[PDB]
Design a protein around this ligand. Structure first.
Ligand SMILES: CC(C)(CC(=O)O)CC(=O)N1Cc2nc[nH]c2C[C@@H]1c1nc(-c2ccncc2)no1
Lengths: 18, 349
């Protein structure tokens, strides 16, 4: 599922700028 | 047509009043822009309470003004750590913007000064913390809840863009929630006061417009793309384009395809398809009718834009607030010392 894929992405925490 | 005579007349008058407001606001902005404020307080005016954040350039502390008892968030940047990190221009520019702008959804710089070694920016303390934490905790916001926040960003971008400012770092991490539940935008280090085009690769991967990824000259339309990303993430609980690595994110962004959760309303999908539009000639916010394509969209049909601006709408969510000085919506850090003792280039601060 999309939600599961989001958790798997490892990008659920605060995101740094480039 | 779609509007009867009285509805068309009221809308037209509302849009002319916005133009009158923006004209006066640009005149105020330019006056402060040309003659900034400097050294309106000093360090011993404040008691140190708690470190709210830290990074490679400096830290942010909760402080209390000794004489008024007012709490503030004090950003402390070390002059040498900024000069040796290629951040001097962004810091000077962020302070220049903050002392010149005036809008109910922009955090207010109350004081600024410098000592022998550090730059200090003292802004009003927003005790609710970032929207990010609340969104991850609750999971996702209802569409009326998302719309309440989105309407404030629309007005804030309408304000900033009238000043020729592109913001370039919209994300929930940069949106603070105040004691009335309204948004306070923080961080102007990436903003640029430029008409026309600019070229810098900057921003956060999930929120990058395709034209940024594709190494194009770009303009304020990137902020309206980022609004689409934010509205999506607020309503879904996850952003429209994500992957393990940014390069895979960028491929999805440029592909011109987006999928929506089945609980998204038809109105929301239509708005988001028009904001998350790869084609600049078709992206809302970037067409003949400007921001009005957004403000007049069906998804915002129930939005009283003036009432949002006047902060007269009851927020759908108010953070828990155990009084002034409450730190609960922020994390816990090691309390390092602030030692004093790089005048070049920081003359303007
Ligand atoms: C240490 C720096 C200042 C520099 C750095 O490392 O690059 C970063 C930092 O710790 N930031 C910036 C920030 N942006 C989004 N969230 C955040 C968190 C934090 C921050 N809280 C606030 C603030 C303002 C008003 N009331 C409450 C809180 N102002 O800044």
């Amino acid at each position: 599922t999309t939600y599961a894929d989001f958790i798997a992405s490892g990008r659920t925490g605060r995101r740094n700028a480039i | 047509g779609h509007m009867g005579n009285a509805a068309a007349a009221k809308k037209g008058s509302e849009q002319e009043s916005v133009k009158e407001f923006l004209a006066k606001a640009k005149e105020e902005f330019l006056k402060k822009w040309e003659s900034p404020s400097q050294n309106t307080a000093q360090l011993d005016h404040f008691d140190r309470i708690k470190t709210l954040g830290t990074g490679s350039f400096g830290r942010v502390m909760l402080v209390k003004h000794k004489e008024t008892g007012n709490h503030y968030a004090m950003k402390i940047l070390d002059k040498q750590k900024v000069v040796k990190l290629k951040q001097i221009e962004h810091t000077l520019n962020e302070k220049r913007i903050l002392q010149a702008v005036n809008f109910p959804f922009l955090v207010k710089l109350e004081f600024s000064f410098k000592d022998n070694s550090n730059l200090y920016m003292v802004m009003e303390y927003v005790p609710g913390g970032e929207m990010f934490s609340h969104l991850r905790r609750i999971g996702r916001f209802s569409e009326p809840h998302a719309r309440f926040y989105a309407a404030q960003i629309v007005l804030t971008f309408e304000y900033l863009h009238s000043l020729d400012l592109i913001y370039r770092d919209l994300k929930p991490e940069n949106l603070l929630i105040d004691q009335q539940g309204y948004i306070q935008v923080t961080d102007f280090g990436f903003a640029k006061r430029v008409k026309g085009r600019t070229w810098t690769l900057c921003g956060t991967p999930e929120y990058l417009a395709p034209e940024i990824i594709l190494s194009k000259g770009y303009n304020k339309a990137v902020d309206w793309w980022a609004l689409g990303v934010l509205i999506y993430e607020m309503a879904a609980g996850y952003p429209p384009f994500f992957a393990d690595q940014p390069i895979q994110i960028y491929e999805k962004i440029v592909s011109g395809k987006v999928r929506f959760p089945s609980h998204f309303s038809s109105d929301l999908k239509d708005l988001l398809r028009n904001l998350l539009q790869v084609d600049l000639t078709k992206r809302f916010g970037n067409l003949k009718n400007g921001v009005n394509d957004i403000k007049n969209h069906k998804w915002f049909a129930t939005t009283d834009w003036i009432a949002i601006y006047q902060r007269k709408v009851e927020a759908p969510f108010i953070p828990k607030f155990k009084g002034p000085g409450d730190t609960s919506n922020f994390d816990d850090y090691e309390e390092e010392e602030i030692r004093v003792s790089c005048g070049k280039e920081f003359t303007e601060f």
